[PDB]
Design a protein around this ligand. Sequence first.
Ligand SMILES: Cc1c(C(=O)O)cnn1-c1ccccc1
Length: 126
Amino acid sequence: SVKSEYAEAAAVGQEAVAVFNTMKAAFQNGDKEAVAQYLARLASLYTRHEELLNRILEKARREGNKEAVTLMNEFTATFQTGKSIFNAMVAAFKNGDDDSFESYLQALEKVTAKGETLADQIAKAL
Ligand SMILES: Cc1c(C(=O)O)cnn1-c1ccccc1
């Protein structure tokens, strides 16, 4: 069901949360080789989540489920905001710009928390 599919996407999202916080600790401690590997892991996790979310949105549209479509349109738009900030963080790491990295890390935390306040409504609508 789209709902088992939603729970699958939610767990993948949670895996990125977990890896992100381990990565933030590694960044603070100065362990750049660890950060590099976590950033690759996260890229894969975020690419996977994006794919699952598009499949859920496409299934909502074929169902003609208007409230689910509306909420997933908003949620996916916010996801692209996170994606752009994440890509900028990765570039700041590549450039050795720790100031920008710290900034982007903070901004991403605020974007993802705001984004996840839509989850309750998505789950009831799907
Ligand atoms: C997971 C997520 C959300 C959310 O879960 O609401 C909002 N943006 N992002 C995101 C974070 C990093 C990369 C791409 C997207």
